[model samples]
Target: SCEVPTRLNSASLKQPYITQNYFPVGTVVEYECRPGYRREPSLSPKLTCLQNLKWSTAVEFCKKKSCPNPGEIRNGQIDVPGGILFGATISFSCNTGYKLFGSTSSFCLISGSSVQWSDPLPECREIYCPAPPQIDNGIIQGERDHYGYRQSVTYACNKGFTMIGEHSIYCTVNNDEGEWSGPPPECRG
Candidate 1:
């Protein structure tokens, strides 16, 4: 068998992988992964060759879009009247004694010609006030979570006390436990 060719020149048909092929500059090629393996981000979906003699990295395709899902809201929760993208401004919180952990907001951002994760996954934590002292009065104003899918949470306290924590949190996903973090901040007289 002949060894691999190292160069392409008019004097010699010397390239091994692309010898004698008529691929014009700026050509495009797409590929698909085998049945079981999932393509990594921007690694297999499509590829393009630039006139600068470079090939675009293959874009990866997964079963579902990798963007994070909407958050979960608790009962009697409220939210602000603003708009949020599919993976932005998502937050999590519990009723009045929980904390957040996984991710308050998971975002997908586009950089150059690729997409990347914007922040660490948020987790809701149960507010465990070890001693439960100095309970002030406040409210969850602005925006909050609702119980339905893709819902948000808004913490609120009674009048008189000043709000000291997040006015609004979002309902987020659970990792098999079916629970979220964050407890609505409340105070007593």
Candidate 2:
């Protein structure tokens, strides 16, 4: 019986269960790529001991895998500390005056021999708030046709009139629309 060949150096063979320094003819061994490496598709890590005191030639399958490009974001930008590669992560942020509607970050993960995103890309949508209600005998500070969520407007009653309710009111988000904290301030004689 022939012993396993020792010329193999491209990969580290798994320890055999036979519990011997050498393997007999027809013995088979399985191996894996060392740290930071992987085998390509259509390659095998299995090798067999031949009767001629040699092991079957195994393909050099260890190589670094490349990750695909992380797509673009509309109304938003991405920050990738590490270039798109296996095990790398990408973070996303919306532009000013925009709101993100999905995942804030994702990872480049291995899928088969290639790499893919761990989560779908996020989207950015413009924020909108409805017009402030008109107040009688009162003036609203910085009045506008449209407002944004959490935006506040101040109000003051006309001369000699007492202001009713809060002097300051902020725009509150209610579903997709904006709502007031309470009724618009009124002026009372």
Candidate 3:
């Protein structure tokens, strides 16, 4: 007869025919927008039960999604704990020596009205290390050809010769480039 104006606390609102608290005339109710809130393009979630009974304005309006300017990250630096809207959760840092790879923690997804960046904008690479391996008689203390990851080279044994396993070998990332946990210490004479 007349019913459909008692729900408005907004958990996100979902109303799906709840038997009959009140809804006669034409009866129709749709409106839905709960995950992070999004659905107000023009407004029309659907609501029709009018005959004078009431309920036919059809104004959902959920809007709260926004995640666009997630660009620029060269050496890498993005904290964002304020203003990206939506769910908002950006995290990517790498500027010490540089080495982040990708996806530290990007999540602002809405994916309907707009708003992206689940994970596809992360890179700070510059930590190379592929030229620090030379120990015949043993002598690679530190010449610095190119070493990044962990950066540490120490192995001296050319005098009388005496050094076996791990004199010192840092650099470790192994895939990005730069692997040397061991295997660079043998000068025993």
Candidate 4:
């Protein structure tokens, strides 16, 4: 007779076998992969008691399971450099003219017996600029509370002032920010 096989990394003796203190020589002990782990088809998930009173050693028979897909963002993208397996990480980025609204990166973490993303998928929101900068002696009849990408504002100098720069400026994206293509037209005397 031999002592019961001890639990091993990522796997444990089946319940019916774990409670028993001993098994006769040549008894085959079954091991099962733990939750969050998956069995490797090529490896054995079993051990046999030997006449020497110890259970035979077995190779790692299980691997960490992968988490569910983190999914997509409407105006952004997710980068999975590695598979979405336990302990793996991913990153998020928004398109031009859009800004990120949550964590830029997230990790795969254990959730109870399963694994899941550490943070919810983030969002990319439309980037808009506050009312264009004000000019000392100019006004824009087309200006409003907000401007969208590619929208343009044309400023006109008052009768007594001459324009010193481009009169029309467009909304453009830069460094993840919404900016006017150029400074507001100056009204030079």
Which portions of model 1 miss their true places by more than 4 Å? Answer: 1-88, 101-103, 111-116, 129-189
Name the TM-score of candidate 1. Answer: 0.23
- Can you write out model 1's per-residue Cα lDDT over 73-99, one digit (the tens) per residue? 542222323334323344444544344
Q: Which run of 10 residues does model 1 get worst, by summed lDDT?
A: 5-14
TM per candidate: 0.23, 0.48, 0.37, 0.72
User: Compared with the true structure, what per-residue lDDT tens digits does model 2 show for residues 22-90?
Assistant: 566677777766543567658877777776577677666566555667878997998999787567899
Candidate 4, 1-189: lDDT as tens digits:
886577677888786988887687778878888766899988888888876677787776789899887887997899999889888999999987889998989999888878888999888888996578888888895667778788888888889999888868889888777777877778988
lDDT (0 to 1) per candidate: 0.41, 0.72, 0.72, 0.83
Ranking by TM-score: 4, 2, 3, 1
Error of 3 at 37 (Å): 6.7
Q: Please list the residue runs of candidate 2 whose C-alpha ends up more than 4 Å from where it truly belongs after superposition.
A: 1-61, 137-189
RMSD of each candidate?
A: 15.9, 8.3, 9.5, 3.6
